[PDB]
Tab-separated table of C-alpha atoms and ligand atoms in Angstrom:
chain	number	residue	atom	x	y	z
A	1	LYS	CA	46.026	12.725	29.395
A	2	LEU	CA	44.203	14.114	26.552
A	3	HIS	CA	44.414	17.558	25.306
A	4	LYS	CA	41.760	20.150	25.383
A	5	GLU	CA	41.712	22.347	21.993
A	6	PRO	CA	39.666	25.308	21.558
A	7	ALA	CA	36.754	25.646	19.623
A	8	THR	CA	33.795	28.674	19.186
A	9	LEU	CA	30.173	27.736	18.510
A	10	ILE	CA	28.738	29.033	15.287
A	11	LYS	CA	25.719	31.003	14.941
A	12	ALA	CA	23.210	30.476	12.133
A	13	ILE	CA	21.248	33.984	13.138
A	14	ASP	CA	23.146	37.135	13.222
A	15	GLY	CA	20.934	40.102	13.465
A	16	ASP	CA	19.074	40.568	9.871
A	17	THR	CA	20.885	37.556	8.528
A	18	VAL	CA	20.039	33.747	8.964
A	19	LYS	CA	22.051	31.065	7.647
A	20	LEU	CA	20.015	28.267	6.017
A	21	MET	CA	19.994	25.190	3.674
A	22	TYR	CA	18.881	26.288	0.554
A	23	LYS	CA	19.075	23.928	-2.548
A	24	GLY	CA	20.613	21.579	-0.554
A	25	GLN	CA	23.677	24.165	-0.235
A	26	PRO	CA	24.254	26.384	2.852
A	27	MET	CA	23.197	30.447	1.787
A	28	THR	CA	23.236	33.427	3.837
A	29	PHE	CA	19.903	35.460	3.768
A	30	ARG	CA	19.253	39.230	4.512
A	31	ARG	CA	15.846	40.116	5.354
A	32	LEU	CA	14.124	42.300	2.817
A	33	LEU	CA	12.562	45.431	3.577
A	34	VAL	CA	14.012	45.761	7.557
A	35	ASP	CA	16.280	46.851	10.008
A	36	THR	CA	16.596	45.740	13.171
A	37	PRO	CA	18.675	47.399	16.340
A	38	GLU	CA	21.948	45.533	17.058
A	39	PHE	CA	22.367	43.398	20.090
A	40	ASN	CA	24.400	46.413	21.725
A	41	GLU	CA	20.975	48.765	20.964
A	42	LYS	CA	18.027	49.222	22.899
A	43	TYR	CA	15.876	46.256	22.045
A	44	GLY	CA	19.009	44.568	19.903
A	45	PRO	CA	18.411	41.407	22.619
A	46	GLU	CA	14.664	41.534	22.308
A	47	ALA	CA	14.934	41.519	18.084
A	48	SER	CA	17.259	38.772	18.891
A	49	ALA	CA	15.408	36.527	21.030
A	50	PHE	CA	11.988	36.620	18.796
A	51	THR	CA	13.843	35.760	15.459
A	52	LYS	CA	15.438	33.087	17.175
A	53	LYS	CA	12.183	31.425	18.849
A	54	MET	CA	10.098	31.868	15.443
A	55	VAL	CA	13.040	30.435	13.521
A	56	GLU	CA	13.975	27.828	15.882
A	57	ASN	CA	10.768	26.728	16.686
A	58	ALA	CA	9.619	26.383	13.030
A	59	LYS	CA	8.521	23.192	11.489
A	60	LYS	CA	8.726	24.702	7.907
A	61	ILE	CA	10.789	27.546	7.221
A	62	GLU	CA	10.303	29.058	3.897
A	63	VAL	CA	12.062	32.029	1.831
A	64	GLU	CA	10.528	34.301	-0.800
A	65	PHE	CA	12.857	36.106	-3.345
A	66	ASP	CA	11.458	39.103	-4.801
A	67	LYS	CA	11.554	40.217	-8.425
A	68	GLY	CA	14.270	42.961	-8.902
A	69	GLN	CA	17.178	41.985	-7.221
A	70	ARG	CA	18.067	38.405	-5.824
A	71	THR	CA	21.578	39.156	-3.716
A	72	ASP	CA	22.822	41.812	-2.052
A	73	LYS	CA	26.348	43.506	-3.229
A	74	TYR	CA	28.086	41.553	-0.093
A	75	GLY	CA	26.479	37.963	-1.323
A	76	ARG	CA	23.689	37.686	0.673
A	77	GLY	CA	20.092	36.135	-0.788
A	78	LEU	CA	17.539	39.332	-0.313
A	79	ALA	CA	14.439	37.359	0.843
A	80	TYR	CA	11.350	37.526	2.845
A	81	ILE	CA	11.647	34.551	5.585
A	82	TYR	CA	8.676	32.194	6.406
A	83	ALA	CA	8.234	30.704	9.834
A	84	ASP	CA	5.408	27.767	9.586
A	85	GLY	CA	3.674	30.340	7.266
A	86	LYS	CA	4.253	33.361	9.393
A	87	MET	CA	6.861	36.346	7.707
A	88	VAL	CA	9.153	36.681	10.279
A	89	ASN	CA	10.035	40.232	8.508
A	90	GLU	CA	6.365	41.091	9.044
A	91	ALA	CA	6.224	40.021	12.788
A	92	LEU	CA	9.330	41.897	13.795
A	93	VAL	CA	8.112	44.975	12.494
A	94	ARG	CA	4.468	44.303	13.989
A	95	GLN	CA	6.192	43.891	17.836
A	96	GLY	CA	8.185	46.992	17.274
A	97	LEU	CA	11.703	45.509	17.287
A	98	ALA	CA	12.548	45.806	13.379
A	99	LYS	CA	11.971	49.364	11.372
A	100	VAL	CA	10.834	49.557	7.590
A	101	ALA	CA	14.147	49.988	5.775
A	102	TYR	CA	15.777	49.672	2.392
A	103	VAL	CA	12.480	49.783	0.142
A	104	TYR	CA	13.656	49.768	-3.534
A	105	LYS	CA	11.363	49.213	-6.532
A	106	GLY	CA	11.755	45.525	-7.922
A	107	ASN	CA	12.468	44.224	-4.269
A	108	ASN	CA	9.426	46.506	-2.654
A	109	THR	CA	6.158	43.460	-3.581
A	110	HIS	CA	5.368	43.350	0.230
A	111	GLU	CA	6.086	46.650	1.153
A	112	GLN	CA	2.679	47.735	2.264
A	113	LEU	CA	2.156	44.807	4.351
A	114	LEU	CA	5.201	46.086	6.484
A	115	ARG	CA	4.127	49.501	6.418
A	116	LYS	CA	1.052	48.355	7.907
A	117	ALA	CA	2.619	46.119	10.240
A	118	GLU	CA	4.831	49.325	11.462
A	119	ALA	CA	2.126	51.779	11.501
A	120	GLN	CA	0.058	49.497	14.158
A	121	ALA	CA	3.261	49.288	16.318
A	122	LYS	CA	3.753	52.853	15.998
A	123	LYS	CA	0.233	53.476	17.117
A	124	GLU	CA	0.841	51.145	20.057
A	125	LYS	CA	3.716	53.339	20.642
A	126	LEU	CA	5.428	49.678	20.991
A	127	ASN	CA	9.495	48.574	21.625
A	128	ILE	CA	11.131	50.719	19.435
A	129	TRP	CA	8.280	52.979	19.517
A	130	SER	CA	7.976	53.491	23.057
A	131	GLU	CA	10.799	56.129	23.151
A	132	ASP	CA	10.368	59.535	23.266
B	1	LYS	CA	2.448	37.111	-10.929
B	2	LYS	CA	2.899	35.965	-7.448
B	3	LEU	CA	5.971	35.157	-5.488
B	4	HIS	CA	6.820	31.963	-4.608
B	5	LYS	CA	7.523	30.560	-1.796
B	6	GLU	CA	10.706	27.873	-1.572
B	7	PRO	CA	12.066	25.401	1.114
B	8	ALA	CA	14.558	26.113	3.718
B	9	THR	CA	16.153	24.522	6.771
B	10	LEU	CA	17.307	26.216	9.439
B	11	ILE	CA	21.138	25.484	10.049
B	12	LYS	CA	21.173	24.527	13.225
B	13	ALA	CA	24.436	24.536	15.492
B	14	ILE	CA	23.150	22.160	18.205
B	15	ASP	CA	21.253	18.987	16.992
B	16	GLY	CA	20.310	15.974	19.199
B	17	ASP	CA	24.335	14.350	19.990
B	18	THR	CA	26.131	16.734	17.153
B	19	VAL	CA	27.487	20.644	17.638
B	20	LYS	CA	28.616	22.843	15.041
B	21	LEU	CA	31.999	24.567	15.532
B	22	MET	CA	34.621	26.534	14.364
B	23	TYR	CA	37.865	24.288	14.712
B	24	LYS	CA	41.145	25.147	13.835
B	25	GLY	CA	39.612	28.141	11.318
B	26	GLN	CA	37.092	26.028	9.936
B	27	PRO	CA	33.433	24.761	10.680
B	28	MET	CA	33.518	21.133	11.751
B	29	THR	CA	30.412	18.813	12.973
B	30	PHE	CA	30.773	17.171	16.441
B	31	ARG	CA	29.502	13.783	17.627
B	32	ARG	CA	29.478	14.078	21.637
B	33	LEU	CA	31.400	10.494	22.736
B	34	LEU	CA	29.895	7.889	24.642
B	35	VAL	CA	26.736	8.956	24.987
B	36	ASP	CA	23.184	8.734	23.169
B	37	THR	CA	20.848	11.748	23.921
B	38	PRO	CA	16.991	11.350	22.895
B	39	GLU	CA	16.548	13.033	19.746
B	40	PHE	CA	13.717	16.101	19.738
B	41	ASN	CA	11.006	14.270	18.870
B	42	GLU	CA	11.591	11.680	21.279
B	43	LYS	CA	10.748	11.949	25.423
B	44	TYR	CA	13.081	14.734	26.938
B	45	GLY	CA	14.327	15.733	23.534
B	46	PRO	CA	13.169	19.062	24.064
B	47	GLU	CA	14.984	18.829	27.358
B	48	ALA	CA	18.563	17.286	26.443
B	49	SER	CA	18.193	19.512	23.673
B	50	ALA	CA	17.665	22.803	26.458
B	51	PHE	CA	20.149	21.990	28.551
B	52	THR	CA	22.697	21.163	25.968
B	53	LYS	CA	21.996	24.554	24.353
B	54	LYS	CA	22.106	26.328	27.958
B	55	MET	CA	25.234	24.741	28.610
B	56	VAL	CA	27.047	25.469	25.642
B	57	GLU	CA	25.643	28.861	24.387
B	58	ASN	CA	25.980	30.376	27.594
B	59	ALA	CA	29.656	29.336	27.605
B	60	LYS	CA	32.532	31.853	27.545
B	61	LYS	CA	35.204	29.264	26.878
B	62	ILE	CA	34.214	25.673	24.809
B	63	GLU	CA	36.781	23.075	23.977
B	64	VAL	CA	37.077	19.981	22.637
B	65	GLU	CA	39.018	16.936	23.566
B	66	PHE	CA	39.688	14.062	21.117
B	67	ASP	CA	40.265	10.409	22.564
B	68	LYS	CA	43.250	8.156	21.210
B	69	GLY	CA	41.067	6.007	18.479
B	70	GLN	CA	38.869	6.893	15.923
B	71	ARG	CA	39.069	11.430	15.652
B	72	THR	CA	36.359	11.240	12.797
B	73	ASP	CA	33.159	8.803	12.188
B	74	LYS	CA	31.649	7.341	8.942
B	75	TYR	CA	29.554	10.463	8.544
B	76	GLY	CA	32.499	12.898	8.974
B	77	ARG	CA	31.422	13.712	12.428
B	78	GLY	CA	34.802	14.575	14.408
B	79	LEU	CA	34.154	12.252	17.707
B	80	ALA	CA	35.221	14.452	20.843
B	81	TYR	CA	34.759	15.281	24.495
B	82	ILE	CA	32.966	18.606	24.578
B	83	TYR	CA	33.698	20.991	27.411
B	84	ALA	CA	31.580	24.249	28.444
B	85	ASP	CA	33.943	26.348	30.393
B	86	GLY	CA	35.686	23.479	32.127
B	87	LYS	CA	32.257	21.050	32.610
B	88	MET	CA	31.785	18.010	30.360
B	89	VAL	CA	28.800	18.451	28.539
B	90	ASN	CA	29.123	14.584	27.802
B	91	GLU	CA	29.544	13.714	31.445
B	92	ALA	CA	26.616	16.150	32.845
B	93	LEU	CA	23.911	15.161	30.478
B	94	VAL	CA	24.619	11.116	31.648
B	95	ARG	CA	24.492	12.546	34.939
B	96	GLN	CA	21.621	14.523	34.917
B	97	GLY	CA	19.502	11.297	33.087
B	98	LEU	CA	19.106	13.187	30.042
B	99	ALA	CA	21.749	10.611	27.621
B	100	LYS	CA	22.475	7.345	27.829
B	101	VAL	CA	26.168	5.713	28.122
B	102	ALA	CA	26.512	4.408	24.165
B	103	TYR	CA	29.092	3.435	21.687
B	104	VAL	CA	31.653	2.519	24.067
B	105	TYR	CA	34.583	1.458	21.400
B	106	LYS	CA	37.933	0.033	23.205
B	107	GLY	CA	40.411	3.265	21.905
B	108	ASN	CA	37.516	5.945	22.119
B	109	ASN	CA	36.832	5.066	26.037
B	110	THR	CA	39.181	7.492	28.026
B	111	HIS	CA	36.242	8.410	30.030
B	112	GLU	CA	34.006	5.415	30.243
B	113	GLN	CA	34.559	5.099	33.884
B	114	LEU	CA	33.331	8.130	34.616
B	115	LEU	CA	30.489	8.536	32.685
B	116	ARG	CA	29.121	5.024	33.530
B	117	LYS	CA	29.254	6.300	37.186
B	118	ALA	CA	27.596	9.142	36.286
B	119	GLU	CA	24.982	6.897	34.755
B	120	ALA	CA	24.736	4.612	37.840
B	121	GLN	CA	23.981	7.772	39.927
B	122	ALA	CA	21.479	8.854	37.423
B	123	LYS	CA	19.261	5.610	37.710
B	124	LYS	CA	19.445	6.091	41.740
B	125	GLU	CA	17.864	9.735	41.459
B	126	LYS	CA	15.550	8.969	39.114
B	127	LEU	CA	15.482	12.374	37.256
B	128	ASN	CA	14.394	12.985	33.421
B	129	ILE	CA	14.997	9.744	31.329
B	130	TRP	CA	15.052	7.447	34.646
B	131	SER	CA	11.542	9.468	36.226
B	132	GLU	CA	9.666	7.074	34.203
B	133	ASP	CA	8.630	4.022	36.053
B	134	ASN	CA	10.666	0.622	34.727
B	135	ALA	CA	12.823	3.143	32.403
B	136	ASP	CA	15.579	1.505	34.228
B	137	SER	CA	14.523	-1.941	32.789
B	138	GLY	CA	16.743	-2.203	29.970
B	139	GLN	CA	13.952	-2.295	27.585
C	1	LIG	C1	18.314	44.854	2.930
C	1	LIG	C2	19.524	45.322	1.865
C	1	LIG	C3	20.671	45.803	2.390
C	1	LIG	N1	21.121	46.195	1.727
C	1	LIG	C4	22.705	46.729	2.077
C	1	LIG	C5	22.685	48.433	2.114
C	1	LIG	C6	24.000	47.709	3.398
C	1	LIG	O1	25.250	48.787	2.473
C	1	LIG	P1	26.096	49.457	3.041
C	1	LIG	O2	26.284	48.881	4.421
C	1	LIG	O3	27.404	49.249	1.858
C	1	LIG	O4	25.253	50.522	3.023
C	1	LIG	C7	23.959	46.942	3.912
C	1	LIG	C8	22.459	46.933	5.360
C	1	LIG	O5	22.870	45.022	5.738
C	1	LIG	P2	23.295	45.196	7.082
C	1	LIG	O6	22.141	45.867	8.331
C	1	LIG	O7	23.071	43.355	7.702
C	1	LIG	O8	24.580	45.290	7.574
C	1	LIG	O9	23.123	45.628	3.144
C	1	LIG	C9	21.325	46.010	0.351
C	1	LIG	O10	21.830	46.524	-0.668
C	1	LIG	N2	19.995	45.963	-0.185
C	1	LIG	C10	19.026	45.108	0.789
C	1	LIG	O11	17.593	44.931	0.286
C	2	LIG	C1	28.811	8.026	19.062
C	2	LIG	C2	29.835	7.683	18.255
C	2	LIG	C3	28.784	7.296	17.177
C	2	LIG	N1	28.374	6.608	15.864
C	2	LIG	C4	27.487	6.252	15.100
C	2	LIG	C5	26.938	5.311	15.326
C	2	LIG	C6	25.293	5.476	14.786
C	2	LIG	O1	25.806	4.913	13.380
C	2	LIG	P1	24.061	4.559	12.722
C	2	LIG	O2	23.177	5.406	12.656
C	2	LIG	O3	24.728	3.534	11.326
C	2	LIG	O4	23.703	3.455	13.870
C	2	LIG	C7	25.322	6.770	14.979
C	2	LIG	C8	24.585	7.382	15.815
C	2	LIG	O5	24.665	8.870	15.882
C	2	LIG	P2	23.367	9.847	16.008
C	2	LIG	O6	22.750	9.121	17.597
C	2	LIG	O7	24.302	11.265	16.349
C	2	LIG	O8	22.524	9.330	15.410
C	2	LIG	O9	26.763	7.395	14.817
C	2	LIG	C9	30.009	5.864	15.516
C	2	LIG	O10	30.626	5.467	14.646
C	2	LIG	N2	31.319	6.197	16.877
C	2	LIG	C10	30.997	7.206	18.148
C	2	LIG	O11	31.794	7.669	18.667
C	3	LIG	CA1	21.014	10.986	19.624
């Protein structure tokens, strides 16, 4: 008889990190300027589902490095991620599924864009901002 | 200066007939034995794709099963039967008219009759691929 052997599915998307092909090689990217709840926190599954749909349904993904630091201390490419023109970082925050975080000079070009989205999500008391 | 946008592509765990799995401690792309699934730009591609993704993403236990002939195809893909909680994905897609039996070679054809049988049945119910008129006309 043939023999069954274990294996486990690879995950490209893990919270604020996504594994993409860049310059013909795989690379781990960590979304700039945001902090998304983990799968075991409130809104964590919702934020994962939103990211998955946004990125898997994109014909075109682009990354935009900022000017201050290309890679964090853990080897992750720090970037804004675009799915068919729309910034994933911004969309999450707009939907109240991520907060603005890790904002540092040099790597904070789109900070105002994100703070604007966050203000709107808080005013709407949406998702993360629905809690007391 | 404005920042510049650069291209990249999503790394896809599931893509057509291929699945990327961690196997003996290392990542490996596998090609499902004995089947041909429509690609995402072809009809039922997004369906066959969703059914695969459902089956495999929701599995608690994934297994691979190599056959007795070629282990790796000429594109560097491991050739295997893929199981999700004990149910073979290869067989399931064929039974659900979401893939055709194909690429059947002596040595790597242990499950040929199981699948051909599933394909035979799949036509009669006329589901998905086989729900089109004359889709079973061998064109
Ligand atoms: C987003 C981001 C995170 N980080 C670091 C800070 C955290 O390190 P410390 O854990 O050592 O405090 C970590 C959070 O990433 P994750 O949220 O992916 O874990 O990544 C940066 O250094 N720069 C950044 O721009
Ligand atoms: C299933 C299978 C495919 N292949 C090859 C045949 C096709 O090569 P050609 O492209 O040269 O025709 C290709 C189809 O794979 P995909 O259907 O995943 O694209 O993989 C094998 O060599 N052995 C197999 O067992
Ligand atoms: Ca195919």
